[PDB]
Every structure is written in C-alpha cells, then in structure tokens.
Amino acid sequence: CGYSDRVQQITLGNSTITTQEAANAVVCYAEWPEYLPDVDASDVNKTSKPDTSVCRFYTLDSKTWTTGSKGWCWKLPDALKDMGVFGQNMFFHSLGRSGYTVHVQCNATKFHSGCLLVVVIPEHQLASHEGGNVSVKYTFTHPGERGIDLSSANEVGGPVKDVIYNMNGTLLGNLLIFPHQFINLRTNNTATIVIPYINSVPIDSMTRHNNVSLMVIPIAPLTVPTGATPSLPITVTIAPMCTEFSGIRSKSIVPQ
Amino acid sequence: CGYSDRVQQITLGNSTITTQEAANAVVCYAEWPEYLPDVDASDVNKTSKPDTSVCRFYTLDSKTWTTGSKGWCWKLPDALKDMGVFGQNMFFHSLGRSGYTVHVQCNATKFHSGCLLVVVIPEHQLASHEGGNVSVKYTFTHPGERGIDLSSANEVGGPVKDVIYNMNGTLLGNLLIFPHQFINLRTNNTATIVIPYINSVPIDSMTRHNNVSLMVIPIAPLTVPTGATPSLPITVTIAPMCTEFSGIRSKSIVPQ
Amino acid sequence: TKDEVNSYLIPLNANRQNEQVFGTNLFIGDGVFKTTLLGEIVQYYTHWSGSLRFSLMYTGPALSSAKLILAYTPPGARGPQDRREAMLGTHVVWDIGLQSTIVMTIPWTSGVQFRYTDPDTYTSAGFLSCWYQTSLILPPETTGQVYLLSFISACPDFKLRLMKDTQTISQTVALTE
Amino acid sequence: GLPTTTLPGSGQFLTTDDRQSPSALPNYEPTPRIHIPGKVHNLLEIIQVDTLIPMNNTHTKDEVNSYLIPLNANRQNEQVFGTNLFIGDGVFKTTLLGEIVQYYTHWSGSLRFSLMYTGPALSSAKLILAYTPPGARGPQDRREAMLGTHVVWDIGLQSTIVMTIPWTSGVQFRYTDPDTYTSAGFLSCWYQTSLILPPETTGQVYLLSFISACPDFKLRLMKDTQTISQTVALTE
Amino acid sequence: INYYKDAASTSSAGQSLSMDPSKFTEPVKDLMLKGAPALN
Amino acid sequence: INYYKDAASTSSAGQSLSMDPSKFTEPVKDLMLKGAPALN
Amino acid sequence: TVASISSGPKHTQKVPILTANETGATMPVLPSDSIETRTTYMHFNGSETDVECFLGRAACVHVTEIQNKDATGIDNHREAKLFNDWKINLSSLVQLRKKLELFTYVRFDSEYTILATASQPDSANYSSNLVVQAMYVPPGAPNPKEWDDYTWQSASNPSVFFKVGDTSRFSVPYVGLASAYNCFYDGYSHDDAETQYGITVLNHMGSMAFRIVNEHDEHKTLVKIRVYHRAKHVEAWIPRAPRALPYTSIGRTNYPKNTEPVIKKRKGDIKSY
Amino acid sequence: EYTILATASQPDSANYSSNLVVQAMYVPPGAPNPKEWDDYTWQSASNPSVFFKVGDTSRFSVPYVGLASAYNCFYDGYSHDDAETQYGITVLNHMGSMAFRIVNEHDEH
C-alpha cells in the first residue's frame, strides 16, 4: 500500500485542477458546503441550483510576488462577478448562496525561499485609512477579479492597506484562527481551502454583501536564488459549489 | 507495505543490471520471449538452447549524446555478433531464434534537460539515400556493436540518415506505435524493453536477416547546466533470452 | 521551413506569466494532426466521433517548476485570445512534478453524433490551447528553452466509419522494382 | 422466375475450376473396373522410391557412366563428390524426385540420399557423407564438412548407406526452382580413411547414388515443367 | 452455403469482435493502474 | 432469404400497419370528444 | 456497451490525468477522469475498422497495354506487346501499399478481378470479340516467350479465358512460403556484399502473363488490362508508423531526394488557430 | 439504392458501337476528387467503385450515410455564426460525390 497525499486532483464540472506538491486541503470549520435545507429556509421561492455550469474552477488573473509585496485580498462572491454564468446568475437574482473551493498556486525551485499565508476571513469588514467614522466606498470593497493589492497606495474612500493590521485593526499573526494554509515554497506550491456558506442568514444578496474574503499574505519574504528573476506568479483559482440562487429578476445595476 | 518500482534488478546468467530510476519495463506486444514449440516448428533438427553462457547482458560500446546528436540505430542480432559465445553460435549455426532484454542507460543531474526515445522496430528496412531502386549494401545494415550513427554523413550504398524520416520514409512522431520507452532525464535514467522473437518464420538465419532494430533518438535536445560538459554517455546493454540455434555447421563467412 | 525534430518540441519560456504556450484547432484530419497515427488512420475514414486523448510530457530539469492550464474550447466560440477566456471552457490545470505527463481528455462535445474528418465548419471540433497558469521557474545554472512533448490518442469510445482514400499519398506513375 | 444477378467473372473459362457439366453420352455404361496392380493415389507415394542420381555429371553426352561416382584407391582426406541441393536443378533435375518436384513450385521435408558400393567384396573403405546446411559455402575440405550433418560410412556386408538430409530451414517451404533465399545447402562425400583394394584388382570402383523423399515430404502449387518442350503440335 | 471446395473461395470473415488494445497501449511488465502513481 | 451481410442490402419493409393520425389531428393537451362541446 | 459513464466532482489522491509517458504506456484515461460526464452508449461495433474491411476491398494493382495484331515478322512477342508479363506485387499502386504497410506481416487469401477494355484508335470497322488469356506463371514454370508458345497450353498452370469488355474473377489462397507475407524485410537473400536488400522471394506471389488468344484482324486493337486485388481472411501483425514520404521503387522503403516537407507548416506562430 | 444507366451515342461518323466500360466512383468528402481521367484517384483502394458496360446498368445499395439520426430536407440555420455564411445549405446532407469516367482508351470516333 503506497501512494501520496501531496498528489491531488479536484474535478468540478468541465474543470480539473491537479497538484503534485499539495498540503492537506482545509475545510473551513470541518464543515463541507451544502444546499440550504427546508428547516433553515425563509424565502419561499424555489432556488435555482445551477449545477456544473457555475460549479467549476475560475482562474483569477495572476499576481506578481516580489520581495516588497505586502499581499493581496479578494472578496467573494465579488471576485467571481465577471466569471461566466456564475456572474450572470449573481446579477440576475436577488438572493444567492454559495460555498467555494479556493486553490492558490505558487510554484518555485528548491532554491527559492518564502512563505505565503492563504487565509479565508468571514465578514472581513475593512477599516478606512481616514479614521473616525469614515466609510469605505462600495467600489473599493468590490474590486472584482483584480482584488485589493495591499502594497498599493491609499485612495479617498478606500480601505487601509497596512497588512500588519489585517486592514481591520487586528494583528497579522492571529489570522491563523481563521481557516488558513501556508504556501511554504520548500514544502508546498498549492494551498486549498474549501469554504462553506457562512452567514447569519440562510441566503443573502451577493452584490451588496461579501460573505468571505481571501487574503494571500507573504510572511517570510521571497528570497530568490542568485541571478534569478526577483518575482513569482501567484494564481488564484476559485470554484463555487452548492450554489443556490433565488428571486430571479431584472439584472441589478451596481456602482462603476 | 512500502518499496519501489523505480528500483529494479535484472539478473541473467552471471550478469546483473541494477537501476534506481527505472521507468516500468516494456514487454513488446505484452508477449514474453519463449522457446519455439513443436506445433510451430518446421526444422526437424533438435535446437541447441545455449542457456546462461549466451543468455546474459552484453554491454555495447558507449555513445556520446551531444546537443547536435541526431540518434543511433542498432540491428539485432547483428549488434551481438562479436559478443562472447552468442556470436560464435550465431556464425556456427544456419538457423537462430532469440528474444532480447534491451537496457539503455543515460544518467544525468537534476539540472540536466533532455529526452531520448528508445524504440524497438521489427523489420526496420532502411531506405537508401540515392533514391530510386538503389539497394542498401550488407556492410552498412550489419555494422555490429558500433551501430549506425544518424548524425554521420551518407555513404555510397549506405542508408539514409535523416532521423526525422526514421531512415525509412515514416515520421519520427509515429514511432511510438512500436514498443518504446523514453529516457526523460528529469524522470528516468534507464529504459528497458523485453523483445520476444518476431518473425513470419519460426526460426531464421541470424546473419542475413535482422529481426528487430533498436533506435535511440534524442527528441528534446540535451540541455546541460551552465559550465557543464555538453555531453552525456549513452550505454546500451543487451541480453539474449530464450535463444535457440539449429543446423550446426562450418562457421559462416560474411562480408567484411 | 523543413520537417524537423524541433517540430515536435513545444517551447516553454521561463518567467512568463499569463501567456500562451500553444494553440491549435481540432481538425484531426488536418494541420498538426494530419501526420500523426490518429490523423493518418482518421483520413482513411470520412466520419469520426468520440473523445480524443491529449498528453503533454515535460522534459525540463527536475529542479524546475511550472503550472500550465490546458484548455479545450468547444465549437461556436473562437480560439481563446487570453487565459481568462480559455479557462471558461474545459480545462486541466497541470502541476509539473514527479509525474512528467498530463493527460487531458477532449470530451466529445458535439450536437451531431458524427463529425467530418475533412475540415468542415459545421462539424468543427473546436480549439485546444495551453497557457502559463503560474510560470516556468528554472533552477540556477540553467538557461534557455525547455520543451513539452505533445501526444494524441483516441479514447475507447472513438468511432470511425465510411472508408475513403487518403490524400496523404500520391503517384503519377506506377512503380517498378 | 427466380431473380438473379450475375457476378463479374461470369462466362470465364478457368482451367482449374472443378464444376459439374452435361454428359455428352447419357445412359452410357463405362467398362467395368478390374484389379490392376500398382495403383497410384498420390505422387507422394512414388516420390518415396529411390532413383539413381547422374552425379558423375561430367560427360559430353548422357552416359551410364554419369550415374557412376568414381572411387580411387589409396586416397586420404580427399573429396569423392560434391553437389548443391537444388533438387529441381543440376544432378537432381532428371531424377524421378526432380521430375515430380518440377511439377510443383514449393517443396518441404527431408530428402533420403543413398550410396551403394559396387567394388569387390574383399575391398574396404570408409566414407563420410556430409550435409552442409545453407548460409555456409560448399565445404572445401573434410574437416569443414564434418562440422555439419554427416554420416561416417563403413563399407562392408551391407552395401548401402542411407543418409537422410534433415529438413534444415527457417522458412517452412523452399522453392523447387533455384533460389538463393531458399537454398537447401550442399552435399559432399569424402574419404574418411581410404579405399583399399584387394591384390589383383586395379583402377576405379564406383558408387551408385540414389535420391528419394522421406514421408514428411511436401509439394504444393502445381506448375508446368521446363523439362519438356515443343514447337509444333504432334501428328500420328 | 459455400459453392466451392476451397477455403480461399469463401467470403470475408466479417469482424473479429475480440479486441485487446492493451498489447499496444500497455505493453508494460509491471501493471499500471489509472490513478496510481505511474512510478513510485 | 437475404443474400447479403448488410441490412441496407435488404428489400423494403412493406407497410407499417401501425397508424396513429391523432398526433397530427388531435395534438391537444385536454381530451376532446366528438359530440362534447369543444370549449366549455 | 457503455461509451461514457456518469461521473461527478472528484476530490481524490488518485490522479488519473497524471502519468509518466516515459513508461511507453498509453493509460486508458477517459472523459470521466477529466470532466463530469453523463451516461452515453456506443451504438457502434467498430465493424468498418476491422482489418478485413480496412484491407479487404478491391484495388487496382496493375495496368498493362497489349495489342492483338499480326505476329508475322516479329521476333519478340513480349516486347511487341502481343503479350505482357506482370510480376505480381501489391506494392506498385501506392494507395493500397500504404494500407498494407501499416503492418509488418500480412496473411491473406487473394481475390483477383481482371478487367480488359479494348480500343481501336485507328480506322476499324468493328469491335473485335477478343478473348484474353490470363496465365499464372509461378517461379520455375516456363515464362511465355511467344504469344502462341507451348507455354500457354497451361497443362498445370492456372489460366483464365475471358472476353474483352467483360471480366474475370478468381480466388487465390495464401501462397506465401512463410506463415505471413513480409511487407518489410530487414535482410538479404544471403551474406553477400552486393545482394539485394529488402527484395526477397518471401513475397513472390508469382507472375501473370496476358495475351489475346484471337488471331489478328486487319485493324490494331489496343487492350488495356486492369488487375484488381481484394484481400480476404486478412490477418495482420506489428502495426507500423504510416508512410509519410512518396515511394520510388517496389519492395523498397526508398524515398526521393529533395522531397517536400509533409508536416503542414502553420500560418502564423505556434499560438495560431 | 442507386441504379446507373449509361447509354452511348456516336453523333458523328462511326463504324461500330464501342464496348465501353464506365467507372462510377463514390468520392466521400475529404477523399481526393479525380483531376484526370486516369489519375491515381480512380484506383479506388478504399473508395467504393463500380465498373459496368455502357448500354447495361449498375445497381448498388448504400446505407443511411447521414451524420445525424436523419437527413434534413430543411435546415433553418447556418454552418456557424457568420454574417455571410450559407443559409440552408449544410453538410448534414452531404451524401458524398460520384465521379464517372469511361475506363476504355480512345477510338478514332
């Protein structure tokens, strides 16, 4: 009896992800994503379960990890609003509910050094940099597949981007209480985090509210071998699962 | 229960081959070599089965794989005509029948890049470079342990040596229909191909006719690390098995 | 310019993000496939059905790393011009490691039960593309291009019918000995 | 009437097809059968019969001498005769085996070669009959010959040796017509010791050579012989 | 119904339903299962 | 008696005695009886 | 027979999509391994891809011009085309050759169809009712030397007589010396420096001689004979790389110098569609 | 079930009615369409072909060769989503092609 736990395959719909250097997948709070049951349901409308047309891996535009990269943050389901049929359903329905399989990818040689913290934060309410009672504007909290680069400059009505304070006034070291995985280049090239639907309500508006936030944060900085390109690509691939939509309706218009 | 399929030992006679980076051995057409049975036999003479004195690994003089190497071809049993007792029996008998365990060896570092195609072609009838109805002369088709270097120049009465056309007017990419194995330096350092006896006749003349032809062809060119010798040795080791000889007789004289 | 061994070698380049590796239509009786065993046998027939098996084998250093995304684009849409477009179709994200080879099956995606082996618009099979998922990272002291080997084979659900003469061979004069 | 479709090759005369045909003599009674000795069912019966080889194939005209292989007294380590084993050619062409063999394209199986000594009873000789399988030349000396299939023949009360040429071939069938690939090899005879003649006897003694088929012999694909010819149709 | 003495006279045999692509596709000594690491 | 291997070689099938004009004449969801008010 | 099985999401340590082609094995990976599949059935037997169907239909193998004319004052009837001889080979017409050469060894019973068609290019009053004789001349048998030689008697040789315009059709069993014909022979007749490579009598099907048995008319009638061969009870071994370059000779793997590239160069880069 | 009837006529001076043999060759899409009357194509090593005398007839069955479960007598569609592509015309109904030659060499007439 031999085989491996580092070699993994995830097939969702027509999409397949393979990894040969995987660290054991994280299932947030030991709870797999599931469809809403009738005993928790409030909305009487029969939910559209879109199956394999949306429950598939959407790869997000790659990020560049440099020696001076502070990190990146994505909001879900926001990040997938422009992704195929999922995005359309998201905008055509009043209510939406979805779990996610997040798959973060960062490959390097055995000469490379560095560690990413891949963490999923439910209700990642961002802090404004202006302090006081200043609000973070819709456009900045809903960036899409672009996400928020924490290495960037502040913007008027935008969030605070000091990765040390998790953009919320909590310390970085404590993010490990949230379902997380490291991409330690010596050990691992892929993180995977299966997220269930986490909310105080059984189903919610997908446009106005982001249930979870994916953060990829360099802890140990990238140290490339001598003469190497001082950069590594980080590719985020997200698949909705157990997705439910309710209250189909004219397409919602959002800011921008 | 743990162990490995990359670590292999083949013991034939007084010879033993070991490998620690083996790709699963190929048995041509899922058929192991066997002695000729009485129901297929034509020749009435009791066959000499020479056992372990010939059924042993003969290592062929090493080849040098450069960045500009096109490939190498050996003919069997021709290549082993000067090898110990097998060669003697080959020349002393009218009829011969033999299977082979081919073992091709090419070791490199984890920094090296390159891929060899090790392929066994039954009835590898070579094409003349002169075109028309020009014949390939005996001496060129029967080189011995030297084999044919495809990187070499053409010779009058010699074969065509464009590896792209498999020396026969077929394309290189299609050789994979023949029992083959790759030596991909990142994965593998040794190919092994067990060849049964393949012929339209139960036993045949070993001198005038070559049943199979071993080709080792660089597909992905050798890319050595910076500052390395731009060469790798390729060593071919062949063992006859289930060898039968019939019609012992004065030693045959061949050209050259 | 001429048929070369290099023609079988798909070049990979280090430190390329979100960039195309290769692209081809899936007329298996034409183009890159014409000369393959699959293509050659396919051209002896008029109709084909079933799934194709597409394999990539990495031949770079063992101490190199790469993630590629193999994408099949069903017909009706153009060949993908970027990765984000490609990944919307059938795709395999390929982590290059100890296992050198990926095997992406092109699933039989057709309305009509049989496609023409000869390039026909109505019975187009679609497009196949490969992209850098992350990048190719080479170890120190290694330079230049590494290569993929591409393989094509039929799945056991493959079908061929209506035999025909190939256009892969020709003659003007009957041969002599 | 039954609908039919005539295939191509309709109205063709094929010399090999065994079809029924209308009899031109209806209700005719053919003469009764009586017992005649020597009924032949198969050619493979009669081809098993020994016939003399004109091995001494060295004469200006066909002679009885052509059947006589000369032996010479007091010759050591010397050749008696030599021949290739194209049985549809050379010395074998005119034999019954050769004649029947030439009516066929392919042959397989073992040949039976016999030598009968006709010298004085008070003479003595040892001969070595050697069959050389194909791939090697015809043996130029005895030491070369004896490496192949051979019978050392002591000449005594039994006048005849019978050396079987064992079927030594890779391909299952050989061509009756001289072909290089399907060469059967060579047959030779040498003095093992010598011919010793008694006092008051001189000159040459002779061997008679016979060729016959072994029961494992095979012939197929009938053909016209080149052993007979004509320019004009014959008259009575 | 065959109208001739010879076997060569008969029509074609139709189809050999017995396929085994394994002899060409998997001519390996050790058994390789789909899903299992090809090498270990 | 068929003289060929192929199904295409056979003669025509004659007649499909199975008619059902209803699929063309009465392709209605609710059943309409002759004599009953067509609408009510 | 199931074509595609039903298969849902996979989260597994068994990665059917990952393998090592270095092994020389083609893993039977299915769509069910890469995607989510629905149940489908084959509705297909693969009858047309059987070698008996693939190799087992008629093909032109030889075409020959012979003339029925007065034989007076002609010294060679073979070369005046009063009769022509064909060394039987399936390697002269390339379309059939490529099919056979997908394999190394082939064992088949043959079925020949000979079609003779007449033409009177010069002034003729009528279309002569000529009868062609097709005579099978196996190796060793006397090859005809004259159009009405004693050879044509065919006392033991197989022979067919048929009218021009009409056709002949005869089966021939597998006549090979070996257990199968060699489409390829990496060897020689014997160990000789100048002997023929590839060419061997292992494939000597025999010969076919064609004459018009009719005496001459006043007008010359040219008869083009076309030999068609159909393989039956086909058995094939050792599949090969398909022929890519054109042929130059019968029984040789030779290809022309300066031959064109057969790999179909792209319009644009490796990225183009 | 096809029936091909070839009938000859010599409108100009002719001494006799030639005993011509027509070849009807089925050329499915992709197969090399004949370019010359005695081209290598007519060899029909894999192509179905019929030879019959002029004045006489040929008769052969052909199974349903359609890609779909049935032929379309009408097709309210296009080959692809293109502004200038052909409407109605589709290869769904490509039975194939038939090439006809007389295999006989020429006479004077």
Place this chain on the structure above:
Amino acid sequence: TVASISSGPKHTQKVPILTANETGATMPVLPSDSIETRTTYMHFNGSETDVECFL
C-alpha cells in the same frame, strides 16, 4: 500427424542407415535415424499431389 519424432543419441546394433539397395526396396529411413530430432507436425495433407489434382 507427426512429421518428425523426438530422438536423442543412438548407440545401437540396429543400423537403420545401413541397408542393401540390391533388394530393390527403399527402406523408410527418417531424419530420426541419422540425427537427433525434435517433434514437428505435418500441417499438410498432400491434397495437391493426388492424381485427380495432378492429372
């Protein structure tokens, strides 16, 4: 039907290779009498040498 029987070394007073052709008899001497033989089968009926086929 057996063509050749298996036969090993012979050290015997029965000399199948020695005869007298003076008798007018052709002794059915086999390869098994002169050499060491392996078992082979005929795979052959002799159909083509029958006089009905020959004549």
Place this chain on the structure above:
RNA sequence: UGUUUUUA
C-alpha cells in the same frame, strides 16, 4: 458518514 449504484 461531504459515499456510489439500482428500483418506485
């Protein structure tokens, strides 16, 4: 049991 089929 984040289990895969088959049947009402």
Place this chain on the structure above:
RNA sequence: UGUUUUUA
C-alpha cells in the same frame, strides 16, 4: 538400471 514416453 547410461531406459523411453505422458502429466504437474
């Protein structure tokens, strides 16, 4: 027993 077949 200087023994020859057949079967595991």
